[PDB]
UniProtKB/TrEMBL annotation:
Upper lineage: Bacteria, Bacillati, Bacillota, Bacilli, Bacillales
InterPro entries documented for this protein: DUF1885, Rbstp2229-like_sf
Name of this chain's protein: Rbstp2229 protein
SUPFAM superfamilies given in the database record: Rbstp2229 protein
Pfam families documented for this protein: DUF1885 (PF08968)
Coiled-coil positions: none
Amino acid sequence: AMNTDLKLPAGKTMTIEDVKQLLERYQMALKKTGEQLGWAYEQAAFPYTVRIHESVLYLQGDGRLYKGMAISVRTAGEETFIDIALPPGATHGDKGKANEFSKWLAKTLGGELHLFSGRTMVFG
């Protein structure tokens, strides 16, 4: 029913095989856009800068929506724990991010996760 055309600049020639290469190039451009979206996901999913001070990891939150948290290792008897402490001013955002990282950590290492909601999850 309908048609679009591009009139090429004077003197420019074009074969169907050149057009096929242009379609491939277009898909390469879409891949690059896809990478930008992925990078945007990465930055939003971990909006913290990490520093270590006195064997405690401090995450400092980007912008007003994230304050931060503190991660440390605790031993008691022959037991070992990873602790994630949220400070008094911790945001809605910080709580969610801490929950996300804690669950990933538990899936990765195994053990028994005690979430600040009072829920316990066992891996193993």
